[model samples]
Target chain A: QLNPESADLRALAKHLYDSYIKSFPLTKAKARAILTGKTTDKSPFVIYDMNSLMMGEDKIKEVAIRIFQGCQFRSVEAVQEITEYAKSIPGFVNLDLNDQVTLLKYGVHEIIYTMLASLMNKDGVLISEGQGFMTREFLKSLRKPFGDFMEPKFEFAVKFNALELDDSDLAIFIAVIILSGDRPGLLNVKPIEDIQDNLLQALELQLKLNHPESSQLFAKLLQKMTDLRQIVTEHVQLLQVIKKTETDMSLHPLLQEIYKDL
Target chain B: ESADLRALAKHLYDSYIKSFPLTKAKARAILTGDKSPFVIYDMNSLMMGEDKIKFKHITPLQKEVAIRIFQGCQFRSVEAVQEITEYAKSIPGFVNLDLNDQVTLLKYGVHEIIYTMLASLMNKDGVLISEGQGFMTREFLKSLRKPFGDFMEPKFEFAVKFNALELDDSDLAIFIAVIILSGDRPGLLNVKPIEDIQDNLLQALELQLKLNHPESSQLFAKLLQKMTDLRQIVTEHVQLLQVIKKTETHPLLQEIY
Candidate 1:
């Protein structure tokens, strides 16, 4: 057990997190497990109750309604789960409550979309609890704002996919993304930075252990972080579109809270 | 309505237990005699590291989580309606009211109580399905198709903030009982007596919120404000249900309101 003050533990947390993810990473299986809320994952078929959806209504409207609801719903669940994961780490909870919220507010969207990247393949998202698949063509078929929603995410995921990141690489990367200490308004930056330094080493070690052939791969992942920020900016633009026009829809309260201060 | 004060107290006590440290299974399990699949997942195992992220390589994805969430919603609504109905009747003089008044109260106010119960069961960020099973994150549930998923947004907004209160089971019981007994409701045949009962419940809730559940100054005022906020949500929820009933026509929802 490396000390939090040392450089080892933070990176160790990164690898361990990555290693756990490797057990079932960005494959369809992990996506199913995530979407269906099953970590056990006993089968391979995702289905939905289309009977409950008013598909008989106008196609574009029906599709858009589901897309908006599904997107907001997942966002809500992701924030809570991300909180739980953060709490599970040692000494993390002892930090100031306000500071914790700040870190989560800044970091979680990137993590959420990255997981979305993992889930996406050439096919597209299995949305509405698997009742519908949201492909580019399907999204394009909708009206103006609705049509614009999934495009930025699709663009990001497709590019990230080319990196050929398996679960192990992603697991470590997610830790780095989350443990970042440079966010503004932090209560204590030094300890957080020390912890992040520890994590960076573990991440580098993970690369050495898992992808020895790659000198360039490590650098590519760091590059992806910059790209991720850009892509998430586009994603936020889509969210703004939904918020402005749709009175009926409600943004997830936590996401709302995060964006408010953010 | 129960003529016995002790009986009414017991009823209030019973309802209070429904609130605390609530799990999705606890809420869903209220459907005791139901005829449908009751899903449960062993959660201690679902998380990483009791010792080293135990990966129990069993992968089953029947799209069960979505179906189970609906199943949970259906039964939870039914059971909450039943529980509140039972509590309302336990109030002395409540049953003696005109049949028309009874119907009016049940029709207009039941969903509000349901909203309260559903919010109580919500984890800080998501809704629970079972103890061992994981959560339906707020965004995840919102991401579902219209009516099915869309209905949840109001609940999520109301609950997330409401959950911050962290009222104990005792607080929730008297509080919920008061929500069910709101005499301010329109069309009460005899508003005076109904208002009397409601005021008494509020006195009790106010005392508890003021004394036992103590926050800083003006905690009671904030609790009242929450009720106001939720009223807006409940109204929209009903409006959405009207839209859903007109279109999807799900059978179970017909009996619920």
Candidate 2:
């Protein structure tokens, strides 16, 4: 739609970040406070020292489910945020309804997890909206199939958690992936890709100026989009595992669609 | 910021050193101040061979340090490729590519991919050449000549800005996997499966980052934005390489670039 390198695109990325992504709670920060016995203002739920915070398998399981549910809840909020974001961007709503839904459907899960990067602390998953944390050892405590379903995800977090990106950069990256030009089933990918291209250009400039002396940072960060794709593949496979074993489980339909479709 | 977090971070750093040890040759050059193990430029020194390699203007000590810094990166580049390739093999769809296709992908994509990882090794003032030693400043690198000296600027320009993102190891690991497993590499015999794998990789990283960094949706989006920047850097690199190939055509530089 416009020159990718333009200030308009850069401002748009910042504007997007400031308006929505900035408002999201820093859950990882909260979990860290609890995990290490530091006192965050809202962390009165468990203000005691972190060393004594380990829970029994039963207690941990309840909390893990809560954390997982928290993630799901955030997805709903993300869908709304991204939908509104697309509208706020100049030409998004003009696309045909089906293409819009197609892009959103394809993109929402990936975008959800892109926002989830910071909940990891290398050793544990920050679960249940930061009310508690769960370590690998605690996750392994669950009965065979239930915990097995989560292990792969944790393995990934161990690796993904190793990345060094801060929050602001992560926000724009998700938006760029969402408005992708290349996702299948698009009536007109050009405009979306056009917008994405502009967003990316703005993002590149932001990174270049904001993170000085790191010439390869943008290139490195770009590579993660491929990883984002791969993770979705893993996500569905895990979901299927859960489906086959956990007959009583209730999965979100939207999430099921995002995983099942592609 | 917690003491536990600080302590854990230290442990992580120590483990990183232990697991990703410096190459033996890199160690020898840096440790002994002898000839560099890997020097990209220094065309004269290159042809003269590693043992006899010499830069006219640089002192033995300066050349020792200068070559050590540049060569250290070159050696790491090789190791980076090796590590990335091994990691790719573990992914379900990547190793499924025809071995030839895999080579073709790496041949073209490694340089672009490796730079992204190398960006982490840098800080604003200078790049950390090794874990404990050999930090090189921008001014000092620019002070050097041909291939070795002149080449650091573009990477530095990219690296300095990139450092500001402050990506973590988990972010880097998935990102590297994405770069290596990319479906868009030129001359790939089969792009579909490669892309399928890439899509999965992207999904895996996206989910992991979200789960890990759920606080800020913006961070995840910004990570995606960084990918576009990576493409731009590689595009510039490819253009630069084209000019180099037609001109000096140093074999080693040609091999990596």
Whole-model lDDT values for every prediction: 0.60, 0.59
User: Model 2 over residues B20-115: C-alpha lDDT tens digits?
Assistant: 455323333453454333332334433343344333212222234445545455555677777656655655556678998889877776777677
TM-score against truth, every candidate: 0.42, 0.47
The clash number for model 2 is 96
> Which lDDT value does model 2 have at A168?
60
For residue A255, give model 2's deviation from the true position in Å.
2.2
lDDT of 2 at A102: 83
lDDT of 2 at A124: 62
Q: Which candidate leads the pack in TM-score?
A: 2
TM-score for candidate 2, please give it: 0.47
Each prediction's DockQ against the real complex: 0.01, 0.06
lDDT of 1 by residue, A1-262 (tens): 4355434545555545744444332344456565455744432233223332344222322667765677777777767666666664444577778777788888888878777776665556655334344555665556788777666777778877776676656666666666665565888866665555455555555665677765334534554564556566666767777778787777777777777644
